[PDB]
Design a protein around this ligand. Structure first.
Ligand SMILES: Nc1ncnc2c1ncn2[C@@H]1O[C@H](COP(=O)(O)OP(=O)(O)O)[C@@H](O)[C@H]1O
Ligand SMILES: [Mg+2]
Length: 352
């Protein structure tokens, strides 16, 4: 690969720095490791790099495939787990034997089929089958909020307290929703009071962004001069800088590569906003209004004024609070003081 491959990296040789973050992740320093960061900050990348370098058995649940749904069924969750387990038995010969006595499992012949299941007994059997730590990756774990008919928390707590060879890695692009999922705020919840080893990926600063591009161009062996305009136009999100780098290498026209990145970002961001608006069709026009209003940032008064201007009616403070709270939980905006801002520059652009 190369530094500007437009897919999550799986090798450190293709990945710019984040050395402290990868090393912390790899430390598996508590039974649960949280990987945080906005979309496109490299979370799936460091997880892949981390598990490749550790050379430990693992189950990888890519939950992004549920992002366009409002609900995940027990059946659809089990089919994903089933697929991963089948990869794991190939690495853990004695697992197929250890899964034989699980109530809802059927074996035929070097594979399993589920025919509810005890997630805690399942995890315990991975641990029985392995001399080494087994990593359970829940990539975009906050998606499990949508898995309404299953509560995995007691099983996660059981593992945390009792399964010493089970190490979870849970990532989330929507920080508040991830914490809400794990019920960190609820004293009676199974994971309350338990510490998570936490790694956060922030957007590149100006100097990091410039160094990232510099490194990828030096590696392609091509000249580049305009690093500052690229940062000014694209911003610090690694994923967008990566795409730009790829396009510029492919075409060598600065304005074309910037415009193509901007147009790709806008399309992707607005599709992701549609995922957000799924199940909120009642408040849909209002959310669009809020984001346009907050594009160049604004205060509560600006949000209120713009909503009431569009609809004519007075709008309560309860409704307003709920709309901004949802946007903040899902990482669309961030509140600085009395100022709410899109969480990165191209989200401003997308609603401009
Ligand atoms: N430090 C980095 N070095 C090289 N590429 C990166 C880096 N950070 C992110 N990327 C690239 O940016 C894109 C988004 O990364 P990804 O791991 O999917 O982010 P997340 O899972 O946080 O949304 C991918 O193309 C990835 O290869
Ligand atoms: Mg990801």
């Amino acid at each position: 690969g190369m530094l500007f491959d437009t897919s999550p990296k799986d090798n450190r040789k293709d990945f710019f720095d984040r050395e402290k973050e990868i090393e912390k992740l790899k430390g598996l320093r508590a039974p649960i490791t949280l990987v945080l960061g906005l979309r496109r900050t490299g979370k799936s990348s460091i997880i892949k790099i981390g598990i490749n370098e550790l050379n430990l058995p693992y189950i990888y649940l890519d939950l992004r495939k549920f992002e366009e749904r409002n609900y995940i069924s027990y059946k659809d969750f089990l089919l994903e787990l089933q697929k991963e387990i089948n990869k794991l038995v190939k690495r853990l010969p004695s697992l197929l034997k250890a899964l034989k006595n699980i109530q809802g499992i059927v074996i035929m012949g070097n594979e399993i089929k589920f025919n509810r299941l005890s997630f805690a007994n399942l995890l315990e059997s991975f641990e029985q089958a392995s001399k080494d730590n087994v990593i359970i990756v829940l990539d975009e774990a906050q998606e499990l909020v949508k898995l309404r008919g299953v509560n995995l928390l007691p099983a996660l707590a059981y593992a945390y307290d009792n399964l010493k060879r089970i190490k979870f890695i849970m990532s989330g692009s929507e920080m508040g929703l991830l914490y809400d999922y794990l019920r960190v705020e609820d004293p009676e919840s199974p994971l309350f009071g338990r510490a998570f080893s936490t790694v956060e990926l922030k957007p590149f600063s100006r100097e990091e962004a410039i160094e990232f591009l510099r490194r990828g161009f030096q590696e392609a062996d091509i000249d580049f001069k305009d690093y500052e305009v690229v940062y000014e136009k694209i911003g610090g999100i690694p994923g967008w800088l990566t795409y730009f780098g790829f396009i510029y290498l492919d075409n060598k026209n600065l304005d074309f590569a910037i415009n193509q990145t901007l147009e790709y970002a806008k399309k992707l961001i607005l599709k992701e906003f549609e995922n957000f608006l799924h199940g909120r069709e009642i408040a849909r026009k209002r959310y669009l209004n809020i984001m346009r209003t907050l594009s160049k940032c604004g205060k509560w008064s600006d949000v209120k004024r713009a909503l009431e201007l569009e609809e004519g009616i007075e709008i309560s403070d309860s409704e307003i609070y709920n709309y901004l709270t949802q946007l903040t939980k899902h990482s669309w905006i961030i509140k600085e003081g009395e100022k709410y801002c899109p969480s990165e520059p191209l989200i401003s652009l997308a609603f401009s």
